[PDB]
Symmetry: C3
């Protein structure tokens, strides 16, 4: 009895996310030398700081992204969840690249990343509603019945 | 063959966690303007720093929380795991709100968050013991037998 | 119908990871008092800073580690994935301990942690290829056929 098929896209986007994230980490450790900010200092020129911060922000949002990706993907629709997952990751790639150049050039891909993410949350929320709402409405309609 | 039912609570608490976390992120980006700490600076008045740090700390503990939530929930008991999950998230909400006002007002909800979390770990540990201990004790009692 | 058996190792390593991570957090909060860096300050002597940073770095990589652990473990091989998982965690334990003493003494276990992690990624990638490649090659060989 196999359950890999219903989940392979979610897992593949998850892996994209892992790679994207590793990339950022490596872009940080390359800016590190080039500034020449030394560990454990994480402050330097305003450019290295911009890069460091992009990485931190992504790395903060990454578990929220994974969490909802799996919940939307399991309770709503795998391919739809996988789809926002890609837009999101893509938006976060543009985000990291804008930021590195300019603080202002980070915002369009941030705005794009925020949309994709909030979409994932709604789908997750809707999928949980479906699962939970009927059984509970069914039982609500038992208290008032009684005839 | 469906497996959504045994997992829906875990997923729902997970989603609460995601929302709670997003909230913190937004409370940070609102304090940001109001201090008027500008990106990528994350240092400012001692109040903005308190808020920034609450967010970081939660965001650090959030995957540990998710990890154990799923392990306790799958190997010990879904509703019990879901239950600490809520206390924990709740404690972390009080934590973020105390911290913002006062560093000292963060501690009671931190202490509460630490309890809920350590509970989750024990349950996870106990559920893994159940799963693993018999099969291994069974096989231990094979070496010394032999008659 | 039960699915706990194919997953118990992954979950157990995950739990090791959670404990390891908690340990770091506690080692940080012990260095905190001992420096005597006070919250929310995260800057101090160059030794407390080294410890703080080890923790941050691990805590950054921890979801990537979990993500791939589960993907490698489900799509490639549970015991192999669980195995790198241990080397990795071990390497990250040596990493945190080297760092605390010396910035230079952090690197061998970092290099070891990076290997274990990249291994996990390959296995995850290979397991996804297996799953996805045939069905897609099969369908590729449909366009050009046609006779
Ligand atoms: C709806 C289809 C979504 C496709 C996601 C595939 C991701 C592959 C990249 C690894
Ligand atoms: C049995 C009652 C379960 C209560 C959980 C509510 C989850 C719905 C939230 C979306
Ligand atoms: C099996 C479903 C039970 C009925 C739930 C009541 C209808 C409310 C949802 C529309
Ligand atoms: C034992 C029952 C636990 C209930 C958790 C329900 C969480 C709903 C909030 C989303
Ligand atoms: C086959 C032996 C498996 C060893 C894993 C031990 C996990 C128990 C820890 C709780
Ligand atoms: C099937 C269970 C095998 C027996 C395990 C030995 C008893 C130890 C656990 C109490
Ligand atoms: C191949 C076997 C891997 C063994 C991993 C067991 C981890 C137990 C520690 C908790
Ligand atoms: C149906 C096509 C699915 C496309 C996803 C590609 C994943 C392979 C990447 C490893
Ligand atoms: C069922 C498998 C379908 C055949 C896929 C074509 C062969 C390519 C992979 C070697």
């Amino acid at each position: 009895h196999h359950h890999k098929d219903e989940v392979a896209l979610l897992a593949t986007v998850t892996l994209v996310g892992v790679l994207l994230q590793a990339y950022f980490s490596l872009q940080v450790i390359s800016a590190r030398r080039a500034f020449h900010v030394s560990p454990p200092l994480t402050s330097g020129p305003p450019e290295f700081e911009r890069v460091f911060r992009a990485q931190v922000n992504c790395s903060e949002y990454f578990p929220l992204f994974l969490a909802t990706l799996w919940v939307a993907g399991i309770f709503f629709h795998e391919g739809a969840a996988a789809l926002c997952g890609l837009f999101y990751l893509f938006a976060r790639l543009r985000y990291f690249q804008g930021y590195a150049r300019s603080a202002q050039l980070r915002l369009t891909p941030l705005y794009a990343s925020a949309r994709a993410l909030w979409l994932l949350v709604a789908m997750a929320a809707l999928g949980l509603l479906v699962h939970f709402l009927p059984g509970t409405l069914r039982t609500a309609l038992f208290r008032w019945l009684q005839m």
